Short mmCIF file of C-alpha atoms and ligand atoms in Angstrom, two decimals:
data_model
loop_
_atom_site.label_atom_id
_atom_site.label_comp_id
_atom_site.label_asym_id
_atom_site.label_seq_id
_atom_site.Cartn_x
_atom_site.Cartn_y
_atom_site.Cartn_z
CA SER Z 1 -33.91 29.81 22.45
CA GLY Z 2 -35.00 26.54 20.94
CA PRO Z 3 -32.39 25.05 17.87
CA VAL Z 4 -34.82 25.48 14.30
CA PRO Z 5 -36.15 22.04 13.56
CA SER Z 6 -35.07 20.66 9.94
CA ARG Z 7 -36.83 17.85 7.69
CA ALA Z 8 -35.26 15.89 5.10
CA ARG Z 9 -35.72 18.19 1.52
CA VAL Z 10 -36.06 14.01 -0.48
CA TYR Z 11 -37.71 10.88 0.74
CA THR Z 12 -39.04 12.60 3.97
CA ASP Z 13 -42.19 10.50 4.43
CA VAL Z 14 -41.34 7.16 2.31
CA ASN Z 15 -41.51 5.56 6.32
CA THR Z 16 -44.75 7.51 6.76
CA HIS Z 17 -46.03 5.85 3.73
CA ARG Z 18 -45.64 2.57 4.08
CA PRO Z 19 -47.23 -0.03 6.60
CA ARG Z 20 -46.34 -0.37 10.09
CA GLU Z 21 -44.09 -4.01 9.82
CA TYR Z 22 -41.63 -2.29 7.49
CA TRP Z 23 -39.87 0.06 9.69
CA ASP Z 24 -41.50 -1.63 12.86
CA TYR Z 25 -38.62 -3.44 13.32
CA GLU Z 26 -39.35 -4.36 17.01
CA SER Z 27 -42.52 -5.72 15.99
CA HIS Z 28 -40.86 -8.30 13.31
CA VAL Z 29 -40.68 -12.00 15.02
CA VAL Z 30 -37.18 -13.99 13.48
CA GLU Z 31 -37.37 -16.43 11.56
CA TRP Z 32 -33.59 -18.62 11.65
CA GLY Z 33 -31.22 -20.42 9.40
CA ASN Z 34 -29.22 -22.80 10.04
CA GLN Z 35 -26.35 -22.32 12.44
CA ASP Z 36 -24.66 -25.70 11.17
CA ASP Z 37 -24.59 -25.14 7.82
CA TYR Z 38 -21.54 -22.58 8.14
CA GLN Z 39 -17.89 -23.50 9.51
CA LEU Z 40 -15.85 -20.36 10.37
CA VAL Z 41 -12.61 -20.18 8.39
CA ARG Z 42 -10.55 -17.30 10.31
CA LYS Z 43 -11.26 -13.97 12.34
CA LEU Z 44 -11.03 -10.96 10.57
CA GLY Z 45 -11.62 -8.86 13.16
CA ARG Z 46 -13.53 -7.25 16.19
CA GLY Z 47 -15.82 -4.60 15.94
CA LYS Z 48 -17.45 -2.60 18.89
CA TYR Z 49 -20.87 -5.19 18.84
CA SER Z 50 -19.20 -7.87 17.07
CA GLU Z 51 -16.70 -9.80 15.24
CA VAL Z 52 -16.77 -11.39 11.63
CA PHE Z 53 -15.31 -13.99 10.80
CA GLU Z 54 -14.59 -15.57 7.44
CA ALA Z 55 -16.54 -18.23 6.48
CA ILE Z 56 -18.04 -21.22 3.87
CA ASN Z 57 -20.93 -22.48 3.63
CA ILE Z 58 -20.60 -26.30 3.47
CA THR Z 59 -23.62 -27.19 1.57
CA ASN Z 60 -22.59 -25.49 -1.40
CA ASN Z 61 -18.70 -24.35 -0.46
CA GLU Z 62 -19.25 -20.70 -0.86
CA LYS Z 63 -17.23 -18.07 0.81
CA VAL Z 64 -19.49 -16.25 3.55
CA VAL Z 65 -18.79 -13.79 5.51
CA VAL Z 66 -20.06 -14.36 9.50
CA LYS Z 67 -20.90 -11.66 11.34
CA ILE Z 68 -21.45 -12.92 15.02
CA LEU Z 69 -22.76 -10.11 17.72
CA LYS Z 70 -23.03 -9.87 20.98
CA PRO Z 71 -25.40 -10.10 23.68
CA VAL Z 72 -26.49 -6.54 22.08
CA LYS Z 73 -29.68 -5.06 22.43
CA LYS Z 74 -32.21 -7.54 20.77
CA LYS Z 75 -33.12 -3.59 19.09
CA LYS Z 76 -29.63 -3.33 17.23
CA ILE Z 77 -30.09 -7.05 15.81
CA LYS Z 78 -33.41 -6.56 15.05
CA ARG Z 79 -32.75 -2.83 13.27
CA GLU Z 80 -30.10 -4.28 11.11
CA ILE Z 81 -31.53 -7.16 9.56
CA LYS Z 82 -34.82 -5.22 8.79
CA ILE Z 83 -32.37 -2.99 7.17
CA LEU Z 84 -30.00 -5.58 5.66
CA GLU Z 85 -34.16 -7.47 4.59
CA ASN Z 86 -35.55 -4.38 3.26
CA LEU Z 87 -32.45 -3.34 0.86
CA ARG Z 88 -31.94 -6.65 -0.13
CA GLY Z 89 -31.59 -6.93 -3.92
CA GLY Z 90 -30.64 -3.28 -4.05
CA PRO Z 91 -27.61 -2.43 -6.33
CA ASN Z 92 -24.59 -2.63 -4.89
CA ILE Z 93 -25.62 -3.13 -1.01
CA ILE Z 94 -24.41 -6.25 0.66
CA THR Z 95 -26.92 -9.20 0.65
CA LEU Z 96 -27.70 -10.40 3.69
CA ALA Z 97 -27.21 -14.11 3.02
CA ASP Z 98 -28.50 -16.12 6.49
CA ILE Z 99 -29.94 -15.65 10.24
CA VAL Z 100 -28.24 -17.73 12.65
CA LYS Z 101 -28.68 -18.44 16.38
CA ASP Z 102 -26.72 -20.80 18.51
CA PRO Z 103 -29.52 -22.77 19.64
CA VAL Z 104 -28.10 -23.60 23.24
CA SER Z 105 -26.08 -20.14 23.78
CA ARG Z 106 -29.03 -18.59 21.28
CA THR Z 107 -26.25 -16.29 20.18
CA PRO Z 108 -26.67 -14.53 16.86
CA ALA Z 109 -24.80 -14.21 13.45
CA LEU Z 110 -25.26 -12.26 10.26
CA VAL Z 111 -24.28 -14.42 6.98
CA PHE Z 112 -22.87 -11.64 4.34
CA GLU Z 113 -21.93 -12.65 0.82
CA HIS Z 114 -18.54 -12.57 0.45
CA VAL Z 115 -16.47 -9.80 -1.19
CA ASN Z 116 -12.87 -10.39 -2.14
CA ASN Z 117 -11.44 -7.04 -1.84
CA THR Z 118 -8.49 -5.69 -2.79
CA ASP Z 119 -6.26 -3.97 0.00
CA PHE Z 120 -7.04 -1.12 0.90
CA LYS Z 121 -3.57 0.12 0.29
CA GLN Z 122 -2.75 -1.20 -3.73
CA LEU Z 123 -5.76 0.47 -5.09
CA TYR Z 124 -3.92 3.77 -4.09
CA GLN Z 125 -1.45 3.24 -6.42
CA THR Z 126 -3.99 2.03 -9.42
CA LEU Z 127 -7.63 4.23 -9.31
CA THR Z 128 -7.67 6.07 -12.42
CA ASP Z 129 -9.63 9.00 -12.66
CA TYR Z 130 -11.73 6.84 -14.32
CA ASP Z 131 -12.31 3.93 -11.80
CA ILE Z 132 -13.24 7.02 -9.21
CA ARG Z 133 -16.37 8.40 -11.17
CA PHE Z 134 -17.26 4.58 -11.86
CA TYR Z 135 -17.31 3.70 -7.88
CA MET Z 136 -18.39 7.22 -6.56
CA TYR Z 137 -21.61 6.32 -9.61
CA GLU Z 138 -21.78 3.04 -7.65
CA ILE Z 139 -21.95 4.07 -4.21
CA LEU Z 140 -24.45 6.77 -5.46
CA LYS Z 141 -26.58 4.37 -6.13
CA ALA Z 142 -26.94 2.48 -3.68
CA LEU Z 143 -27.21 5.94 -1.49
CA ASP Z 144 -29.70 6.46 -3.94
CA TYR Z 145 -31.43 3.68 -3.06
CA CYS Z 146 -31.46 3.12 0.66
CA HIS Z 147 -32.59 6.65 1.13
CA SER Z 148 -35.59 6.32 -0.96
CA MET Z 149 -36.33 2.96 1.35
CA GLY Z 150 -35.93 5.16 4.18
CA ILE Z 151 -32.98 4.09 6.05
CA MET Z 152 -29.57 6.78 6.63
CA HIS Z 153 -26.88 4.26 6.80
CA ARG Z 154 -25.25 7.10 9.02
CA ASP Z 155 -21.44 5.33 9.06
CA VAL Z 156 -20.51 5.97 5.15
CA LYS Z 157 -16.53 5.82 5.39
CA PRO Z 158 -13.79 3.59 2.76
CA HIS Z 159 -13.65 0.84 5.20
CA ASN Z 160 -17.68 0.05 4.92
CA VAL Z 161 -17.04 0.49 0.93
CA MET Z 162 -15.65 -3.08 -0.19
CA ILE Z 163 -14.50 -2.82 -4.08
CA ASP Z 164 -13.12 -6.53 -5.08
CA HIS Z 165 -11.23 -4.10 -8.23
CA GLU Z 166 -10.61 -7.04 -9.80
CA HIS Z 167 -14.44 -7.14 -11.47
CA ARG Z 168 -15.27 -3.67 -11.00
CA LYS Z 169 -17.90 -4.87 -8.00
CA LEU Z 170 -18.51 -2.28 -4.88
CA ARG Z 171 -21.09 -2.79 -1.92
CA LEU Z 172 -21.93 -0.64 1.04
CA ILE Z 173 -21.56 -2.22 4.29
CA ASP Z 174 -22.11 -2.28 7.76
CA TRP Z 175 -25.40 -1.92 8.39
CA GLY Z 176 -25.57 -1.36 12.56
CA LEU Z 177 -24.92 1.92 12.82
CA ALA Z 178 -28.25 2.45 10.01
CA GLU Z 179 -31.86 3.58 10.55
CA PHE Z 180 -35.06 4.41 9.67
CA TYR Z 181 -35.92 7.74 9.43
CA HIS Z 182 -38.83 9.95 10.33
CA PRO Z 183 -39.49 13.60 10.19
CA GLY Z 184 -39.19 15.99 13.10
CA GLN Z 185 -37.07 12.77 15.28
CA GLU Z 186 -34.00 13.50 17.60
CA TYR Z 187 -31.12 10.93 16.85
CA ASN Z 188 -28.22 10.27 18.33
CA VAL Z 189 -25.40 12.16 17.20
CA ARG Z 190 -22.81 9.18 18.32
CA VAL Z 191 -22.26 7.60 14.73
CA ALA Z 192 -20.40 7.62 11.71
CA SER Z 193 -16.23 7.55 12.11
CA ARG Z 194 -14.57 10.95 13.70
CA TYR Z 195 -13.32 11.59 10.48
CA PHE Z 196 -16.76 11.33 8.20
CA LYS Z 197 -18.90 13.03 11.10
CA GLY Z 198 -20.86 15.60 9.51
CA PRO Z 199 -21.32 19.23 11.01
CA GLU Z 200 -24.82 18.45 12.17
CA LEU Z 201 -23.39 16.06 14.19
CA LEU Z 202 -20.31 17.97 15.71
CA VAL Z 203 -22.72 20.25 16.68
CA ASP Z 204 -24.77 18.26 18.16
CA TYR Z 205 -27.79 19.31 16.15
CA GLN Z 206 -29.69 15.98 16.25
CA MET Z 207 -32.62 16.33 13.98
CA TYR Z 208 -30.34 15.21 10.96
CA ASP Z 209 -31.34 13.67 7.97
CA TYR Z 210 -30.29 11.81 4.68
CA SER Z 211 -27.75 14.19 4.26
CA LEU Z 212 -25.89 12.78 6.91
CA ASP Z 213 -24.03 10.16 4.38
CA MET Z 214 -23.32 12.63 1.28
CA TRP Z 215 -21.51 14.91 4.30
CA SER Z 216 -19.22 11.32 4.78
CA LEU Z 217 -19.62 10.62 1.05
CA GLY Z 218 -17.60 14.23 0.50
CA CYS Z 219 -15.38 13.22 2.39
CA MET Z 220 -14.55 10.24 1.00
CA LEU Z 221 -14.23 11.38 -2.78
CA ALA Z 222 -12.18 14.71 -1.24
CA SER Z 223 -9.36 11.97 0.33
CA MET Z 224 -9.68 9.46 -3.17
CA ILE Z 225 -8.91 12.39 -5.30
CA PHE Z 226 -6.65 14.60 -3.31
CA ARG Z 227 -4.62 11.12 -2.30
CA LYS Z 228 -5.18 12.77 1.64
CA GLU Z 229 -6.62 9.89 3.62
CA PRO Z 230 -8.80 10.54 5.59
CA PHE Z 231 -9.01 14.07 4.36
CA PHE Z 232 -10.46 15.53 7.79
CA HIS Z 233 -8.33 14.65 10.52
CA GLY Z 234 -8.85 15.79 14.19
CA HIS Z 235 -8.05 13.93 17.13
CA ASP Z 236 -11.43 13.89 18.76
CA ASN Z 237 -14.75 15.42 17.82
CA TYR Z 238 -13.84 18.89 18.71
CA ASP Z 239 -10.31 18.84 16.65
CA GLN Z 240 -12.65 17.39 14.08
CA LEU Z 241 -14.63 20.45 13.40
CA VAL Z 242 -11.93 22.59 13.30
CA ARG Z 243 -10.31 20.43 10.39
CA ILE Z 244 -13.44 21.39 8.55
CA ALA Z 245 -13.48 25.03 9.68
CA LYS Z 246 -10.10 25.04 8.72
CA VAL Z 247 -11.12 24.57 5.39
CA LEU Z 248 -14.23 25.47 4.56
CA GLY Z 249 -13.57 28.26 6.93
CA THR Z 250 -15.67 29.87 9.77
CA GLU Z 251 -17.87 31.95 8.17
CA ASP Z 252 -20.26 29.23 6.75
CA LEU Z 253 -19.90 27.92 9.50
CA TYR Z 254 -21.06 30.42 11.75
CA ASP Z 255 -23.96 31.37 9.63
CA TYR Z 256 -24.61 27.82 9.65
CA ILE Z 257 -25.40 28.03 13.90
CA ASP Z 258 -27.32 31.02 13.18
CA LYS Z 259 -29.91 29.53 10.95
CA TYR Z 260 -30.54 26.90 12.76
CA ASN Z 261 -29.85 28.72 16.28
CA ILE Z 262 -27.42 26.07 16.88
CA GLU Z 263 -25.48 27.86 19.57
CA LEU Z 264 -22.02 25.96 20.87
CA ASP Z 265 -19.80 24.37 23.59
CA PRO Z 266 -18.30 28.07 24.31
CA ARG Z 267 -14.98 25.98 24.50
CA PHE Z 268 -15.34 25.72 20.45
CA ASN Z 269 -15.59 29.12 20.38
CA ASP Z 270 -11.68 29.53 21.83
CA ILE Z 271 -10.41 26.50 19.54
CA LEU Z 272 -12.45 27.37 16.32
CA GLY Z 273 -11.02 30.81 15.98
CA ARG Z 274 -10.92 32.31 12.67
CA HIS Z 275 -10.68 30.87 9.07
CA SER Z 276 -10.55 32.09 5.75
CA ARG Z 277 -12.72 29.66 3.41
CA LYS Z 278 -9.94 27.70 0.70
CA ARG Z 279 -9.88 27.04 -2.86
CA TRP Z 280 -10.53 23.61 -3.86
CA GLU Z 281 -8.22 24.12 -5.83
CA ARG Z 282 -4.87 24.73 -3.30
CA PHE Z 283 -5.18 20.53 -2.08
CA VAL Z 284 -4.52 20.01 -6.06
CA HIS Z 285 -0.10 18.78 -6.59
CA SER Z 286 1.61 17.23 -9.05
CA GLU Z 287 0.41 13.76 -7.54
CA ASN Z 288 -3.04 13.93 -7.49
CA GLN Z 289 -3.66 16.19 -10.70
CA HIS Z 290 -4.54 13.07 -12.62
CA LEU Z 291 -7.67 12.64 -10.30
CA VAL Z 292 -8.48 16.15 -9.93
CA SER Z 293 -10.75 17.60 -12.83
CA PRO Z 294 -13.34 20.85 -12.81
CA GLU Z 295 -16.23 18.76 -12.89
CA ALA Z 296 -14.64 17.06 -9.64
CA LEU Z 297 -14.05 20.07 -7.40
CA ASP Z 298 -17.40 21.62 -8.49
CA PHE Z 299 -18.88 18.53 -7.36
CA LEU Z 300 -16.85 17.61 -4.22
CA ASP Z 301 -17.54 21.51 -3.19
CA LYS Z 302 -21.14 20.40 -3.59
CA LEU Z 303 -21.45 17.67 -1.26
CA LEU Z 304 -19.08 19.21 1.39
CA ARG Z 305 -21.83 22.39 2.73
CA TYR Z 306 -21.83 22.91 6.10
CA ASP Z 307 -25.90 23.39 5.99
CA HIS Z 308 -27.43 19.44 5.25
CA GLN Z 309 -30.09 21.13 3.48
CA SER Z 310 -27.86 22.15 0.47
CA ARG Z 311 -25.84 19.69 0.18
CA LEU Z 312 -26.49 17.85 -2.85
CA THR Z 313 -29.34 14.86 -2.52
CA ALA Z 314 -28.18 11.15 -3.91
CA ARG Z 315 -29.82 11.73 -7.26
CA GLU Z 316 -28.71 15.14 -7.66
CA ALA Z 317 -25.37 13.87 -7.40
CA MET Z 318 -25.69 11.02 -10.51
CA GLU Z 319 -26.89 14.00 -12.61
CA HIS Z 320 -23.47 15.78 -12.48
CA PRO Z 321 -21.39 16.19 -15.38
CA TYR Z 322 -18.87 14.62 -13.03
CA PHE Z 323 -20.85 11.39 -14.13
CA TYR Z 324 -20.92 11.65 -17.89
CA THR Z 325 -18.81 9.50 -18.95
CA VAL Z 326 -19.50 6.98 -16.30
CA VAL Z 327 -23.60 7.39 -17.38
CA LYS Z 328 -22.51 7.17 -21.21
CA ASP Z 329 -20.63 3.73 -20.69
CA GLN Z 330 -23.97 2.50 -18.06
CA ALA Z 331 -26.45 2.67 -20.89
CA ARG Z 332 -26.18 -1.03 -20.69
CA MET Z 333 -27.71 -3.73 -23.38
CA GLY Z 334 -26.48 -6.89 -20.91
N1 ANP X 1 -18.83 -8.86 2.97
C1 ANP X 1 -17.42 -8.90 3.65
N2 ANP X 1 -16.69 -9.42 2.60
C2 ANP X 1 -15.19 -9.48 3.29
N3 ANP X 1 -14.77 -8.87 3.79
C3 ANP X 1 -15.51 -8.36 4.81
C4 ANP X 1 -17.28 -8.29 4.56
N4 ANP X 1 -17.80 -7.82 5.76
C5 ANP X 1 -16.85 -7.41 6.36
N5 ANP X 1 -15.02 -7.59 6.06
C6 ANP X 1 -14.33 -7.89 7.09
O1 ANP X 1 -14.52 -6.74 8.21
C7 ANP X 1 -14.84 -5.88 8.13
C8 ANP X 1 -15.97 -5.53 9.71
O2 ANP X 1 -16.78 -5.84 8.66
P1 ANP X 1 -17.98 -4.77 9.48
O3 ANP X 1 -19.37 -5.28 9.21
O4 ANP X 1 -18.09 -2.91 9.50
O5 ANP X 1 -17.84 -4.66 11.25
P2 ANP X 1 -18.75 -4.00 12.72
O6 ANP X 1 -17.91 -3.52 13.98
O7 ANP X 1 -19.83 -4.06 12.32
N6 ANP X 1 -17.95 -2.10 11.79
P3 ANP X 1 -16.67 -1.19 13.11
O8 ANP X 1 -18.31 -0.91 14.06
O9 ANP X 1 -17.12 0.79 12.25
O10 ANP X 1 -15.67 -1.88 13.21
C9 ANP X 1 -14.26 -4.87 7.25
O11 ANP X 1 -13.40 -4.07 7.72
C10 ANP X 1 -13.32 -5.81 6.43
O12 ANP X 1 -12.52 -6.15 6.82
MG1 MG X 2 -17.29 -1.17 9.66
MG1 MG X 3 -20.58 -1.12 13.35
#
């Protein structure tokens, strides 16, 4: 028994049909900006390989964000930078504004546009139905774009989407788990926040593709419209799968594993239990129903599918009726 291989059903050969230089972020030598253009104002936080600061560009007094990076692999730094430069100018993609190295210690930093994003509280109490379609659409543009440019984000979640609500401004950020898609390649399933990990990662199927981001996006949509964050709340990776099977049900779980000849850690077998597929309706209540509509559920239903080959692509999703009034507004004359 070997597992059945898989390929992206869209954008499969984007990197195949581009010069090596496009995807070979190791060959890339780096051209460095000037670290003395930037003053740190305040630490915004520490992640696994970095700390992020709010800063000011001193030559022009603009706020920027500076992500200072570990002695990490030089590979990780170069990957993020290459992906960042390849995608710059793309819609709702965060602009890498500059790259700087401390010339003595040689420790790298990335300098990003600043986004004055609304507190992930306060949005919660004010987003309307129209707001969600709109922002879901803007996310889809970024995700179609990067997918078309051969890149999986691999860390789609609400904290990696910056929204400046007073400006109706959205940016997809943290490109540090992001990677080039090459068909047939096996990837690390250690990616994405737990709550946004697709089933393919939870069953340790390594040949996955852009569809992963559409799962994570689905989880986001669910949490926005049901106002439950996160929507699937497992307490570890094992328990994450179970949270999924509890809603989508075990029958399609096992048909999925069956189809790819996947075979599970036997422990999973005892804790998975047996679960009916639930109706989306079950999660709709008085407090969330103004954000719910049948097109919203039909839309969500087509994101949250066990089978990665079955999920809506980014561009199909932008085609869905759910976005009718959004696209209608965005025939923009300018
Ligand atoms: N462009 C930006 N504008 C404003 N705030 C930002 C920006 N980028 C990051 N932040 C803040 O800093 C946090 C972390 O940014 P991120 O790029 O995800 O760091 P990371 O450590 O690489 N990711 P993770 O590994 O998930 O912790 C965000 O949740 C924001 O509060
Ligand atoms: Mg992040
Ligand atoms: Mg990260």
